[PDB]
Design a protein around this ligand. Structure first.
Ligand SMILES: O=C(O)CCc1c[nH]c2ccccc12
Ligand SMILES: O=C(O)CCc1c[nH]c2ccccc12
Ligand SMILES: O=C(O)CCc1c[nH]c2ccccc12
Ligand SMILES: O=C(O)CCc1c[nH]c2ccccc12
Lengths: 155, 157, 153, 153, 157, 155
């Protein structure tokens, strides 16, 4: 039985994230989305977890959990040793490569990167929030449920 | 039954490739190494030679097999009932041009591509640079499996 | 009297190229597509395919050329190039030619990011995929696609 | 009726920025420099410094703004941004914002490669160097440089 | 009498830094490690601690010395009668932003900068990532000299 | 006594190359410019060597020699173990990094990279030849003597 962890802050989850979740769930027997609790953002951890669960309702082999500290501990504690992450640019690859090599060195945990779907290559949680704050329409870039909650926080 | 295809020309296979094979074999139920052959331009090693060098250095990976092919990689993948490619990457430059091919492959056949950063120690080895260095007498013994190094010197002499 | 030149081999023109043409036509009074003159299509064929695909762009025209792009540009009274860009790698090598062109002829180059949907399309990859039976119909203008099938079949 | 907006904080404007302004003014009928509103200079100060440095550009004006750049652009009847670029790293992060801006408001972005001589100048590095006594006089408009000395001395 | 300055905050020095020091010491008659201290924000280690960790792991480099400084690097370099900086680089992204600073330093003071690719084995270590990983309990003993690892754990506990 | 080798095809030498030569000569006791003879280009090896010698007449600690085969053999045969090369882009760095790591691995030879002077960041031997072929003026980008010879070959 194979498995991977998809880590992030997901504040909020975007369609870019969801695309990665879907592709991981299609290729591994089990996927765990790991939501970081940090020393902070727009949505509480529980809010983020619920938005991810709504968006991944049709992925039966994917579950969502929170964690803190070293990601490789979160991964190994659950019997796995693979991370799956989405990538948008060469710059992304160079920073993430450092962390991937470090994670493999310290804990034997592998990282698999997947290129973003072209349609979602310019979406990030940060930019979506920023645009929405000033009234820009980001409804095509977020799951439907997320866009609903986001308008709420902003009002 | 999960599975992935690890493609390349593997002319010859390097320790960087082998590292990628091992990591894929650890994470997928089956792995197929796809040895892509250009029917127009012969490489240094024949198809038989390429496959033998890979098999000899992967004997301890019981869920990996090696097959050659040509034409579209996505056809090789789909005809085996799979839809994942695993490829090793060294640089940001690598990521950008492989990004193009992965998006195209997803578009035309729904095949996914997963990239892995190769191990630091093998980051600077490529089949082509190993060949070039060996051609002019440089020592590349530590970058190639034992199944390769002396066959390579043999080809060159 | 603003104007820009959109250069390339366009063998064949793709929807990525067409997107750039449309954006250049929307921002300059005058756009010329400059077709460089052994690929798949003849110069006349490439010109025709672009003309077919840009009929709704009244301020655009298509011409062939040879030699330095800056001479093609300057001989038509203009001094700006508009070119599409996909990657950072693209930017760094196009940057060298942009600075060279500015240096030798005072011709400016404006780059525009490809539309997300065409980030992975190029003339070369479309031909390669199509050659092995892959469906590239969503990546090429309708006219082009039929013509491409013909060259292969 | 062509036009483009050149955005930034310009704290202060550098010769790199000015080069881009001049190139945009040469290719569009109308250029607006958009100054975003705790840096070194006040908004009024930054606006003044740019106006001083662009007196020879008759089709350029300088205005301050807040919020989404695309709204600043659209509210003035335009839909193009012109921005200067130094590196491939620059292109990849600016690319994300360019595609976002096109998506949300249909505003195009044209990038231009910095002049070779200004490849290493930025507002931040000029301030940092000047703060420790380094001579940045060859990298800033004459007016700006004097004003900068004043803020430090 | 040739010479180069190797700058950094070295908070703490890593094996990647040490590799760069050794390569500079091999190619220049004298090398000065320049420990740059921000008078506004304290790092994890004091200036004394940073210098001691560097000295302890460079004892076999007789043409290298260690001095702290602040403000413009080019002033530190020129006041010692030198005009070369040697810096290690990992990525293309590293090269682009260090490129800016090297051009600026050449412009304002005529100081040259030479970059070296760090060794593959140390490519992914940085002072900041080593600190972050150690903070949350990860094992970074193989990435730092002996002079550093336990002092680091000490700071953290 | 310190030393470095500056390798290339130099077909022809540009002001970008010369800038690198000057900076190497200022920092090492001895510099050797190594001109590759290849399996080819516009200028013969002897022509290239003479153009480099004219351009570096004021660098007494720099000499010019031809070589073939493995660069690290050329370097070690002359008692040195350092290469100095100019770099223009991050892309350049990524390709050259591979070769530098390989050269250090196989022969213990170090490589030091130096960023191009801003004024010469867009010049290359290849682009200068191409531009000159079609009548473009590249005289500000090449040593004076080189531009003279180049016009000759083209006529
Ligand atoms: O955003 C990421 O890629 C990593 C998030 C992350 C770091 N440590 C973690 C521990 C538990 C869950 C998530 C994380
Ligand atoms: O592909 C490109 O961008 C350059 C094509 C090109 C070079 N010189 C040219 C002259 C005329 C028309 C096109 C060209
Ligand atoms: O620096 C930039 O390129 C963006 C500045 C910017 C964002 N929103 C803006 C609104 C008005 C004027 C300027 C801005
Ligand atoms: O162009 C380069 O950087 C390398 C040229 C080169 C490779 N092997 C060489 C051997 C002798 C002289 C030069 C060379």
């Amino acid at each position: 039985m194979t498995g991977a962890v998809c880590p992030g802050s997901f504040d909020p989850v975007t369609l870019g994230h969801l695309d990665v979740f879907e592709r991981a769930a299609a290729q591994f027997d089990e996927v765990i989305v790991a939501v970081l609790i940090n020393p902070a953002g727009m949505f509480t951890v529980d809010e983020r977890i619920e938005m991810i669960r709504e968006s991944t309702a049709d992925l039966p082999n994917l579950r969502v959990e929170s964690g803190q500290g070293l990601l490789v501990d979160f991964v190994r504690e659950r019997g796995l040793n693979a991370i799956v992450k989405g990538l948008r640019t060469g710059t992304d690859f160079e920073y993430e490569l450092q962390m991937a090599q470090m994670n493999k060195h310290i804990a034997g945990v592998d990282t698999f990167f997947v290129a973003t779907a072209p349609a979602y290559s310019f979406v990030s949680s940060s930019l979506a929030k920023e645009v929405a704050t000033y009234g820009g329409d980001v409804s095509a870039l977020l799951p439907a449920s997320v866009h609903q909650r986001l308008l709420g926080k902003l009002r």
